[PDB]
Design an enzyme around this catalytic site. Structure first.
Site, PDB file in Angstrom:
ATOM      1  N   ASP B 159      45.428  33.154  37.299  1.00 24.57           N
ATOM      2  CA  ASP B 159      44.569  34.112  36.615  1.00 24.57           C
ATOM      3  C   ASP B 159      45.285  34.787  35.445  1.00 24.57           C
ATOM      4  OD1 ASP B 159      42.203  35.239  36.334  1.00 24.57           O
ATOM      5  OD2 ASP B 159      42.296  36.558  38.112  1.00 24.57           O
ATOM      6  N   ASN B 392      50.918  31.413  46.779  1.00 26.30           N
ATOM      7  CA  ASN B 392      49.591  32.008  46.665  1.00 26.30           C
ATOM      8  C   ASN B 392      48.584  30.922  46.308  1.00 26.30           C
ATOM      9  OD1 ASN B 392      47.850  34.666  46.352  1.00 26.30           O
ATOM     10  ND2 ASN B 392      47.367  33.346  44.608  1.00 26.30           N
ATOM     11  N   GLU B 393      47.646  30.673  47.215  1.00 26.57           N
ATOM     12  CA  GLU B 393      46.522  29.770  46.976  1.00 26.57           C
ATOM     13  C   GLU B 393      46.928  28.379  46.509  1.00 26.57           C
ATOM     14  OE1 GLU B 393      43.667  31.665  44.408  1.00 26.57           O
ATOM     15  OE2 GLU B 393      42.876  32.873  46.055  1.00 26.57           O
ATOM     16  N   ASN B 444      42.475  34.610  51.212  1.00 25.18           N
ATOM     17  CA  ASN B 444      41.800  35.216  50.081  1.00 25.18           C
ATOM     18  C   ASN B 444      40.331  34.805  50.160  1.00 25.18           C
ATOM     19  OD1 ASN B 444      44.367  36.022  49.484  1.00 25.18           O
ATOM     20  ND2 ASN B 444      44.567  34.825  47.589  1.00 25.18           N
ATOM     21  N   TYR B 446      36.327  35.823  48.890  1.00 24.35           N
ATOM     22  CA  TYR B 446      35.492  36.608  47.998  1.00 24.35           C
ATOM     23  C   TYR B 446      34.012  36.443  48.300  1.00 24.35           C
ATOM     24  CZ  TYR B 446      39.570  37.617  45.310  1.00 24.35           C
ATOM     25  OH  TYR B 446      40.796  38.068  44.910  1.00 24.35           O
ATOM     26  N   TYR B 450      32.636  35.284  44.650  1.00 25.52           N
ATOM     27  CA  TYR B 450      32.721  33.858  44.349  1.00 25.52           C
ATOM     28  C   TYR B 450      31.837  33.016  45.255  1.00 25.52           C
ATOM     29  CZ  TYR B 450      36.709  34.947  41.369  1.00 25.52           C
ATOM     30  OH  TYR B 450      37.533  35.462  40.411  1.00 25.52           O
ATOM     31  N   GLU B 482      43.089  39.217  49.927  1.00 21.04           N
ATOM     32  CA  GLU B 482      42.311  39.490  48.728  1.00 21.04           C
ATOM     33  C   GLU B 482      40.835  39.469  49.088  1.00 21.04           C
ATOM     34  OE1 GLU B 482      43.162  37.097  45.291  1.00 21.04           O
ATOM     35  OE2 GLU B 482      45.337  37.162  45.665  1.00 21.04           O
ATOM     36  N   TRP B 527      41.661  43.282  46.491  1.00 13.77           N
ATOM     37  CA  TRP B 527      41.988  42.823  45.152  1.00 13.77           C
ATOM     38  C   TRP B 527      40.933  43.403  44.221  1.00 13.77           C
ATOM     39  CZ3 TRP B 527      46.374  40.630  43.514  1.00 13.77           C
ATOM     40  CH2 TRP B 527      46.406  40.110  42.205  1.00 13.77           C
ATOM     41  N   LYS B 546      38.542  43.576  38.638  1.00 14.05           N
ATOM     42  CA  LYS B 546      38.384  43.841  40.063  1.00 14.05           C
ATOM     43  C   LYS B 546      39.146  45.083  40.511  1.00 14.05           C
ATOM     44  CE  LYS B 546      36.975  39.197  41.644  1.00 14.05           C
ATOM     45  NZ  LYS B 546      37.339  38.416  40.401  1.00 14.05           N
TER      46      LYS B 546
END
Ligand SMILES: [Ca+2]
Ligand SMILES: [Ca+2]
Lengths: 569, 569
Positions: B159, B392-393, B444, B446, B450, B482, B527, B546
């Protein structure tokens, strides 16, 4: 004489709204000097009706115009209307009107917020006619609102933009030539039974009338052939705050027909309570404004429905028509949704000596009484109206104001012996000289804003102390009719500061704490419902930002905290 | 070896921050080819250090620069430093560095978020010296964060904006020539007494050493002349979340002196709980970023204090160093304030086949191990760090990622046996292939943003169902690392809509309801903490919005609802 126009088998309405032609004077009274009305207008632009004209164009000269502007359109009288009575009705023209039909003057009007009409039966031609309307915005010391001209610059001391235009619908309507002119209804209650007192005025009192009272199911519950009667409604469905019930006075007279909705409800003031139908009522709401984007003060019924949805959502039960009568459409809506209303005349701006021979004088007084007569005639039958407000923030510390408002209070009480009378205070409690004439004491107080700005810790002790002084001096119930803080949407800060959304919430909350410790407060009205436009000034960020909602009717932070409080009340 | 530099009677720090001279390459590697380091830089601008360079100027070419830029300044060696060991330390240079001293290369470094140094004892002159630093921002498949170049355009799938510059203090410091090189401290607790295991490395292991353990009032509670020992601290003041206590390992070695703060606290993972000092700990906090206005990722200690005040005000007890190690000053601040930290290496962007021999391969893997070693050596002694996050991810649905992350996890476990290991998930639970190597499962999610954007009623069932699947597949405690929603400050709507302040509050609320029904969830991290800048894109309104706070560290509406919840836990 001002019954709201209706459509039925006997009466018919022709709306004259839409797009008119428009032009402004280029010097003071140019239109009257050059007799612009005697022929169609030339060098015009389009102007919507109903609407203020000030925010429609890209032209600062028109926005800030001082003086008169000219509207014009055409309308038709159909062959089918040949032998009817014809009436041209203006819901309002702000502030002053001269009306011309086919080049000839037929009526004038002074006052920007109350309707007026003209009988054109013997003047309108079948087929095409030309309607010309001169609209003037000048306020002098004998107008309401009060203002004055300096050398032309318009001066005044009220805090809303002096929008001008045709703000409410224009209607041509027909009735039979023998017709119902006026109706008055008053109601009483004996336990379960309602009593309806009515009085009907016609222009042929010897002829036959049939009067029905119909319930919301349209079913007849009472019947009479008298023009004045007292009729009993067994087990009456009362009109309640938040739960409206409207009966219908359904009147057949010759070839004529009029149907007047009305509510059965009582009002009684005790020492410390406000009773509707015997049960204590605590005002929760706002003073409002007729104001929105683009159209200024123009009537917008979708805006009105949105506002009522917001009022219900936030737990409000009431509003005040600050600082002038609103459109009857809004009053009809309040009748139907069970919203309680404080109806106010535009006696605002009497502040900065004000009550003197060369300013607010006996001529102002006589016009003040006339405005009240007109307001009463128009709204006397609304059950939503529970109180008349005869002034907003006059300079009532002046000794000369005492005789002024004694005269005004005596007049409205002669017109209406049933609703309480009031008016809102801004001077110090120790100096005020008029609130003893009122039934309810209403105060506008901005602790934490105009007094002690930013000092959150001082709001609660300040308002509590002041409230007790108002109660000790007059011994009447008290409404806080205004309090709040300007708030820019999106302005956040921690710790909070004036203009932030957090400060607005905290300011209102500390004022509410003071009110909650008093036993004589019968209401709280936050200022303001929605952000609105003001005359330009360094304390006004594109208008007044005290709205709990934005001008586009979306909530700021404080709206959610207010809702939590009002919905538990 | 990477002991944080200190000032005392024996060691001295010279800060080399302030304003440097600056120039960017006009073609790829222009400065290397033309050997700019050989003479003072010419045609330069001023650039502050520490700071990113991207947001300082009005020049879009510098903001979007791909490749290398050149920093230069002068520093002095005092006469008084005559026979001392001299070290040049860079807290970080993002992402790649070549260091020159008086025109000669002296070291290089790869990776933008960890410190490096160079012994210049025999190369710096008394008096004036010239320090030149080349700074490269290019990320390839073997860098962390991952990226790649296309033809020059930089590509990556993380990001945040790829800021570059000298983001942390530059320091010239001095020590005696025989000196303390490294320290490792580990702690255990037997009932009421604490056991401090330490190992000290010097460059003359036969010489006398004196080791004190001092309490917070600086009084001696333990004493030893061993380089490696195990000393009892009776009635030990434990380091606790929200109540830090820091002892000091105070070491005298020849002419050298070093004082190392440390904390006594235990970590134990159970079935369903995360115990700190034997008491269950529930993570309440945020993943953060090193980001603010003007300076990009530059260290700003004033902003760091404001963020800790905000974390305290809102009731947070922890944060994750989202997607890269932070400045040590922030790690030190977390030690002193009792804030619990998840410490993460920059293995971000391994997502879109990613784990192929031509992309994330064994060269990436070996560098990933090196970064973990550098991170462990820097942060091993911080009591605030309770867990390592190694990625991360990642695209952990790929079969090839299994052997990759089994290798990374086993390496970090050898370096540190005391702290739990984790990594954050974005792939679906059915396809994930690595979380069995972790002690805690971090996801994470959303929902409401998302997935099912705008569908508030679907948030709670979706999250609860996913949470249960993660628990059932791996049987470990779960943190939601997140969740949240982009929110424009000042955007209000009733009913709420995505991007409005009201929606962010409801979205978070509904996710919280799912977590509250799950006895295996040990943390919630919203997040994001604050609005931060991203690479440009149609879903990013001037960055990622966010934030619970704006980029200027002021709260949006949801901050107040989060505070009510976290403070009553
Ligand atoms: Ca009207
Ligand atoms: Ca540093």
């Amino acid at each position: 004489d001002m019954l709201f126009p209706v459509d039925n088998e006997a009466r018919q309405i022709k709306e004259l709204n839409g797009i008119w032609k428009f032009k402004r004077d280029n010097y003071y009274k140019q239109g009257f000097e050059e007799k612009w009305f005697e022929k169609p207008l030339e060098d015009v632009i389009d102007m919507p009706v109903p609407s203020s004209y000030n925010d429609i164009t890209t032209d600062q000269e028109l926005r800030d115009h001082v003086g008169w502007v000219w509207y014009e359109r055409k309308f038709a009288v159909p062959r089918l209307w040949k032998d009817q009575r014809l009436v041209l009705r203006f819901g309002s023209v702000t502030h002053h009107a001269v009306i011309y039909l086919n080049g000839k003057e037929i009526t004038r009007h002074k006052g920007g917020f109350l309707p007026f009409e003209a009988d054109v039966t013997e003047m309108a031609n079948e087929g095409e006619n030309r309607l010309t309307v001169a609209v003037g915005n000048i306020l002098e010391w004998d107008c309401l609102p009060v203002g004055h001209i300096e050398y032309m610059e318009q001066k005044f001391d009220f805090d809303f933009f002096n929008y001008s235009g045709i703000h409410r619908p224009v209607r041509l309507y027909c009735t039979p030539k023998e017709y119902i002119e006026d109706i008055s209804v008053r109601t009483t209650v004996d336990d379960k039974d309602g009593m309806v007192h009515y009085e009907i005025k016609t222009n042929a009192e010897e002829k036959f009338i049939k009067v029905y009272i119909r319930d919301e199911k349209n079913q007849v519950v009472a019947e009479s052939n008298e023009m004045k009667d007292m009729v009993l409604v067994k087990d009456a469905q009362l009109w309640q705050p938040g739960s409206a019930y409207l009966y219908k006075l359904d009147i057949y007279f010759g070839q004529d027909h009029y149907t007047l909705p009305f509510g059965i409800r009582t009002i009684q003031l005790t020492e410390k309570q406000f009773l509707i139908n015997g049960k204590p009522f605590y005002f929760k709401g706002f003073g409002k404004h007729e104001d929105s984007d683009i159209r200024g003060k123009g009537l917008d019924e979708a805006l009105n429905v949105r506002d009522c949805e917001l009022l219900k959502w936030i737990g409000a039960n009431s509003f005040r028509t600050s600082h002038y009568p609103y459109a009857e459409e809004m009053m009809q809506m309040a009748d139907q949704k069970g919203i309680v209303v404080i109806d106010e005349v535009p006696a605002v701006g009497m502040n900065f000596g004000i009550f003197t021979e060369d300013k607010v004088n006996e001529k102002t007084l006589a016009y003040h009484k006339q405005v009240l007569k007109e307001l009463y005639q128009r709204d006397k039958n609304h059950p939503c109206v529970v109180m008349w407000s005869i002034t907003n923030e006059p300079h009532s510390s002046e000794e000369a104001s005492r005789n002024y408002f004694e005269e005004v209070t005596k007049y409205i009480r002669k017109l209406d012996s049933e609703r309480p009378i009031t008016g809102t205070m801004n001077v110090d409690v120790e100096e005020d000289k008029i609130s003893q004439f009122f039934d309810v004491v209403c105060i506008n107080r901005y602790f934490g804003w105009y007094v002690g700005a930013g000092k959150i810790e001082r709001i609660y002790p300040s308002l509590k102390t002041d409230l007790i002084k108002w109660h000790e001096k007059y011994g009447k119930p008290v409404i806080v009719t205004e309090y709040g803080a300007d708030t820019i949407a999106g302005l956040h800060k921690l710790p909070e500061v004036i203009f932030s959304e957090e400060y607005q919430k905290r300011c209102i909350e500390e004022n509410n704490k003071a009110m909650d410790e008093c036993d004589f407060v019968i209401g709280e009205h936050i200022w303001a419902f929605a952000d609105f436009m003001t005359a330009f000034g360094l304390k006004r960020v594109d208008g007044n930002k005290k709205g709990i909602f934005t001008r586009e009717r979306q909530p700021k932070t404080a709206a959610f905290a207010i809702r939590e409080r009002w919905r538990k009340m």
